[PDB]
Amino acid sequence: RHMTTAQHPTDEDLLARVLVPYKDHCKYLRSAVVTESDTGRAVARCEFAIPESCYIDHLNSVEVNICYNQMMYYLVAKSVKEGLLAGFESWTLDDFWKHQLPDILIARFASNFRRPVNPRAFSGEMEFQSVTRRPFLHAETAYRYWDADSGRCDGEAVLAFV
Amino acid sequence: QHPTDEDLLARVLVPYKDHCKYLRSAVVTESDTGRAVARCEFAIPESCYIDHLNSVEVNICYNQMMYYLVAKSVKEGLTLDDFWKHQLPDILIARFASNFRRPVNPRAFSGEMEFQSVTRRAPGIPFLHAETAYRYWDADSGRCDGEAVLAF
Numbered sequence: 386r387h388m389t390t391a392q393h394p395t396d397e398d399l400l401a402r403v404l405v406p407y408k409d410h411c412k413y414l415r416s417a418v419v420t421e422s423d424t425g426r427a428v429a430r431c432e433f434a435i436p437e438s439c440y441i442d443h444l445n446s447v448e449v450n451i452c453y454n455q456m457m458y459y460l461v462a463k464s465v466k467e468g469l470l471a472g473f474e475s476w477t478l479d480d481f482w483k484h485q486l487p488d489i490l491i492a493r494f495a496s497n498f499r500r501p502v503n504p505r506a507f508s509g510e511m512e513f514q515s516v517t518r519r520p521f522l523h524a525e526t527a528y529r530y531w532d533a534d535s536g537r538c539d540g541e542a543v544l545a546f547v
Numbered sequence: 548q549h550p551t552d553e554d555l556l557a558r559v560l561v562p563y564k565d566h567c568k569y570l571r572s573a574v575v576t577e578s579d580t581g582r583a584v585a586r587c588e589f590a591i592p593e594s595c596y597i598d599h600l601n602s603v604e605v606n607i608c609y610n611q612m613m614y615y616l617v618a619k620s621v622k623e624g625l626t627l628d629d630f631w632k633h634q635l636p637d638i639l640i641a642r643f644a645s646n647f648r649r650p651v652n653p654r655a656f657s658g659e660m661e662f663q664s665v666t667r668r669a670p671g672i673p674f675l676h677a678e679t680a681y682r683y684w685d686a687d688s689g690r691c692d693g694e695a696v697l698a699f
Contacts, residue, residue, distance in 0.1 A: 406597045406598040407596060407597050408595075408596055408597070411596040411597070439564075439595075439596050440563060440564055440567040440595050440596055440607060441562050441563045441564065441567065442562050442564075445640070446606055446640045446643040446695075447603065447606050447607055447610070450602055450603050450606055451596060451603055454603065490647065491601065491602045491647065492646070492647055493644070493645065493646045493647070494602040494644065494645050495642070495643070495644040495645075496642065496643050496644075497641070497642045498639065498640070498641050498642070540644075
């Protein structure tokens, strides 16, 4: 980790498992490369597409949040599987999936419009900034979405691993 | 103190998918300082986008309630046709935020929102800037709250 950087291509079966509970037309995350930082932070670099809205007939805050959830569940599952999630290095994906996954709660969530993002196709990324005990793990994360034309938005989300 | 306007309510709810229409009643009022407030009831019978009240649903409830509050505010001055056609699609949430304090029951819960400041800005096209805040609560300690900045 100080010597190399772990980096993983999209995990298609993990991605479909993540997306399985969503309505067909609310499935937006399409690919996700997972990394670890020199300091042990888990990062996801993702692509997204919204061919049609999920809940109502640019990229809006509802969709920003749906996309985060998907990106966040994927990154968490894939990081635990590959030993990159601070706090869970002694856990396996199994133990985590049925026991921690359900009890991930978004404690706080925030989004900010910068330039309108084309909902049809656009990129995103997120970081586990910190993980900290509080008898639960409190994790800060940051995220950002962009397209091929300066569209951008971003924000943060504090997670509680119960 | 304006009671739910069922005509307006349905107009606000019309673009949403059936399993995504949460706002049931919405009493509108003005603080004596002219701030527009909406005391609302909600229900999330089915879920809209997936299998407690989560941040996606907090944000959908917010939009429904905020559009209702705005449209009714115009309708009482705080023409809809003009607004509905011209201004109402140029409402942009510039920032949104939510905080979950105690788990809220999504089948039945209450909420409130208000326009805290509305300021004209001219950076660069002139436009109205609004700071809003909202809270949700249920009958049993449930609460979450947050803020949204709007641009007209």
